[PDB]
């Protein structure tokens, strides 16, 4: 029925209209300063005027860093382009790393557009070259009340004749894109053959010409890849071009200049609009100093939207360096341009509260004494261990045909499962690397 | 109508020098660094001098001191029509393009060439369109009267023009622009446009371009889309030689003239020794642009070597280049720059709050206050007041911790996080 993995318990940050973080709201406990800072980011990005600022989360394991990322993503909404990312995947084997960085930065920028398409439909009565002739064909579409003839381009007619359409075939044809598609045969010819694989469909209703506005959203990266290389086509030259190069290539600076100029013209027209995005990169400490020194310039850009980072280390050596040991594995030059949100760990009461909340969303019922147990051993080992053991305890209750997780259930669960500490301890007494 | 937002360099528009290379203390958003701004004027006179080439200048200094701001202000001072290139040292490091030819292309893109071409344009409102032809034999003879404020002339149009006029649908009242050589048609408005003057207007069309584009075009018939997509690489040097000779003879006969561009390279301390030697040898080129170095790193070991060269660069590069540095900022410089931030991003910060932000910027860092002034906007408007007070600044300071504060916090919380070995304690008991 329901699916979850350490998350989906977040329905929002859980603030008020005044910006004060409620103690328990949106399935959140503690981190009041962190939640208020996240709301500061919320009304930073709602202003959509700021650009080029970096905010990272400083916290250890189980500190709710990526949980806070899920919270901010949830409160951002579908319209706001949020792009989660992992600091390890930025390493690319086919293209340079900085190209991937700029690619995801351009992905972060989204922009709503409005457009109207022209729709033609009906049954074609003639497929004949005009006449002393050239590769053009007149086509006459017959709808329920639409009756028009159309002369078409050689390429679109080539796509038409590759669609194997004929007289008595109702088709769906667009004017702007030019994509061809046959709906089928008219029901008037259903009786003509007693049996036929081809299915008969009614004549299109209404008039052949149609109009409608489209408010579809598109990121600037999608436009850049659209005008960088062709995307689709029903004519042979389209596949020729696509198969000429399937390799992804970098983007020139002048290409970015022209795409931002054209989108500036479109937004000046009064139709286009722009909305910044949020970039979340997991374990930014995992990437190399090369990306750091490229971001030293990338942060100083103009259209570069707000980026959120996270780390799980302290006074550690920077990747690609020997003597450059820095906090969070981030060199000082970038941290001068970085702002930090401090996080805090969780003690017994809030650990118990989060476990019982995620058990409620887990649709598992835990008795009070078993709640006390999971509060107990969820502290001297980790909260994550009790979080994992929640489901096996419920299933062990189910096997005993009981709907309540009891102290005995968690007892056998912890007896037949060992944590990292127990694994290390039993590794201490090893005959042959046990 | 450029699309610009608030940025760490969007405030400055021009260096703000004098005729005698005298920098005004507060000019065009650029403040302080009198010697640096005088050197900026010197490199200006270099770049619009045009008679010198192959000059390398080094700009160094402490972090966050605005050397990148100095370069951005210089670029703004150059203005339009001057080919300027700004890039860091990480973009060159690529696998499809080796470092050497990438740097060659970086040099090549810098210098631009002006091309002046005269065009014949026919622009006037149409009266009617009448095309003679055959029903099945062709024999197309198109005619259409073209009118303006001072002529009413009938024109017999050839096959190409009326084929185009059949391609794009136009009506009698529509106005179109006709060029004789190309034969293309451009219509913009309907009786919207009020054409005037002579039909046979003889106006030139001037196109600027760097020699990189012509090099890529001549390298390959696919060079058009190659430069439009960047998937070029390893152009034969004989093409470079022939194109250099061709533009040379063009210069002597004067049909096209070159515009020596400006190259900006950042983070040269992370540059490789092979690239250093390539720069050392390519500086002697006659077509060598004026390039400045932006090294934010001091004494460090040059990449590819185990030797800790000063300024992170080998002395061979430093010998054939001049070096200027930048200094710190006294508290009044911080005051001025934060005032420029407040006016640029529209912050009505309180005077006492302004002083508190000035102090916090002075002791900690400039960019910390530069972001605090931005966050103070929403910290104030959340209580619905346009002005920003001292309590908002203190709230921003306590909410968003500082780098030194985080360093201290982790120094007594080493066990909270992982170490160099990676060990970390997660249990809260024993």
């Amino acid at each position: 029925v329901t699916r979850t993995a350490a998350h989906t318990h977040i329905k929002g940050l859980g603030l008020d209209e005044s910006g004060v973080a409620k103690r328990v709201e949106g399935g959140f406990v503690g981190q009041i300063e962190a939640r208020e800072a996240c709301g500061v980011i919320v009304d930073l990005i709602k202003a959509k005027k700021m650009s080029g600022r970096a905010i990272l989360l400083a916290g250890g394991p189980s500190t709710g860093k990526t949980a806070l990322a899920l919270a901010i993503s949830q409160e951002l909404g579908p319209k706001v382009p949020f792009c989660p990312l992992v600091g390890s995947e930025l390493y690319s084997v086919e293209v340079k790393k900085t190209e991937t960085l700029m690619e995801n930065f351009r992905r972060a920028i989204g922009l709503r557009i409005k457009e109207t398409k022209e729709v033609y439909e009906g049954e074609v009565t003639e497929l004949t070259p005009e006449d002393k002739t050239i590769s053009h064909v007149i086509v006459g579409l017959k709808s329920a009340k639409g009756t028009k003839t159309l002369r078409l381009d050689p390429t679109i007619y080539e796509s038409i004749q590759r669609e194997k359409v004929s007289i008595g075939d109702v088709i769906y044809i667009e004017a702007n894109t030019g994509a061809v598609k046959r709906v089928g045969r008219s029901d008037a010819y259903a009786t003509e053959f007693d049996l036929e694989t081809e299915e008969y469909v009614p004549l299109p209703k209404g008039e052949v010409h149609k109009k409608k506005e489209i408010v579809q959203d598109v990121t600037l990266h999608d436009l850049d890849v659209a005008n960088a290389r062709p995307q689709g086509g029903q004519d042979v030259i389209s596949m020729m071009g696509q198969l000429l190069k399937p390799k992804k290539t970098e983007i020139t600076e002048k290409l970015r200049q022209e795409v931002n100029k054209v989108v500036a013209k479109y937004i000046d027209q009064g139709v286009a609009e722009l909305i910044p995005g949020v970039l979340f990169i997991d374990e930014v400490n995992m990437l190399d100093i090369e990306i750091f020194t490229y971001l030293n310039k990338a942060l100083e850009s103009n259209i570069a939207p707000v980026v959120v980072l996270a780390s799980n280390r302290g006074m550690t050596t920077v990747r690609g360096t020997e003597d450059v040991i820095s906090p969070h594995g981030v060199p000082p030059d970038l941290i001068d341009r970085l702002l930090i949100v401090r996080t805090l760990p969780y003690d017994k009461d809030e650990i118990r509260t989060i476990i019982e909340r995620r058990a409620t969303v887990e649709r598992l019922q835990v008795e009070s004494s078993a709640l006390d147990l999971l509060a107990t051993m969820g502290t001297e080992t980790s909260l994550r261990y009790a979080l994992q053991l929640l489901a096996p305890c419920g299933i062990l209750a189910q096997t005993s045909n009981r709907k309540e997780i009891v102290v005995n259930d968690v007892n056998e669960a912890k007896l037949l499962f060992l944590d990292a500490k127990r694994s290390t301890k039993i590794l201490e007494t090893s005959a042959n690397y046990l | 109508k450029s699309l610009s937002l608030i940025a760490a360099h969007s405030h400055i528009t021009g260096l703000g020098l004098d005729e005698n290379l005298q920098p005004r203390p507060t000019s065009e958003g650029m403040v302080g660094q009198l010697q640096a701004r005088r050197a900026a004027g010197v490199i200006l006179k270099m770049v619009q001098n045009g008679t010198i080439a192959g000059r390398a200048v080094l700009v160094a200094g402490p972090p966050s001191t605005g050397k990148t701001a100095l370069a951005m202000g210089v670029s703004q001072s150059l203005g339009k029509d001057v080919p300027f290139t700004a890039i860091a040292g990480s973009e060159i490091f690529s696998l499809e393009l080796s470092k050497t030819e990438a740097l060659t292309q970086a040099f090549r893109k810098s210098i631009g060439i002006k091309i002046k071409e005269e065009t014949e344009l026919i622009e006037g409102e149409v009266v009617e369109i009448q095309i003679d032809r055959s029903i099945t034999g062709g024999h197309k003879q198109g005619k259409l009267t073209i009118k303006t404020t001072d002529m009413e002339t009938i024109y017999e149009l050839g096959n190409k023009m009326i084929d185009g006029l059949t391609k794009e649908k136009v009506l009698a009242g529509d106005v179109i622009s006709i060029d004789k050589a190309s034969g293309k048609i451009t219509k913009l408005g309907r009786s919207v446009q009020c054409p005037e003057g002579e039909l046979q207007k003889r106006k030139t069309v001037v196109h600027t371009v760097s020699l990189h584009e012509i090099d890529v075009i001549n390298s390959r018939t696919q060079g058009f889309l190659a430069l439009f997509t960047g998937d070029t690489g390893e152009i034969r040097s004989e093409v470079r030689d022939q194109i250099n000779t061709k533009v040379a003879e063009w210069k002597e006969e004067g049909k096209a003239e070159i515009v020596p561009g400006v190259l900006f390279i950042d983070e040269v301390h992370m540059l490789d020794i092979e690239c250093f030697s390539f720069i050392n040898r390519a500086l002697e080129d006659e077509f060598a642009p004026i390039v400045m170095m932006a090294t934010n790193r001091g004494v460090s070991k040059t990449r590819g070597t185990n030797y800790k060269s000063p300024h992170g660069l080998p002395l061979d590069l430093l010998d054939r280049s001049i070096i200027i540095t930048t200094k710190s900022y006294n508290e009044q410089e911080i005051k001025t720059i934060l005032s420029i931030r407040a006016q640029e991003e529209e912050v009505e910060l309180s005077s006492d709050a302004l002083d508190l932000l000035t102090k916090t910027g002075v002791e900690t860092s400039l960019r910390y206050s530069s972001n605090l002034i931005s966050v103070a906007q929403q910290i104030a408007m959340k209580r619905k007041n346009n002005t920003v007070e001292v309590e908002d600044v203190k709230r921003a300071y306590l909410l968003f911790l500082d780098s030194a504060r985080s360093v201290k916090y982790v120094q007594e919380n080493e066990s909270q996080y992982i170490d160099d070995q990676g060990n970390v304690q997660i249990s809260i008991a024993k």
Binding site: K148, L150 | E128, I129, S134, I135, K167, K169, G173
Partner: peptide, 22 residues
Amino acid sequence: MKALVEEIDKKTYNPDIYFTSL
């Protein structure tokens, strides 16, 4: 640019004709 699909009649329209007046 040129519209891929254009209005075409049978009685008044003809491929050779192209007349536009006031």
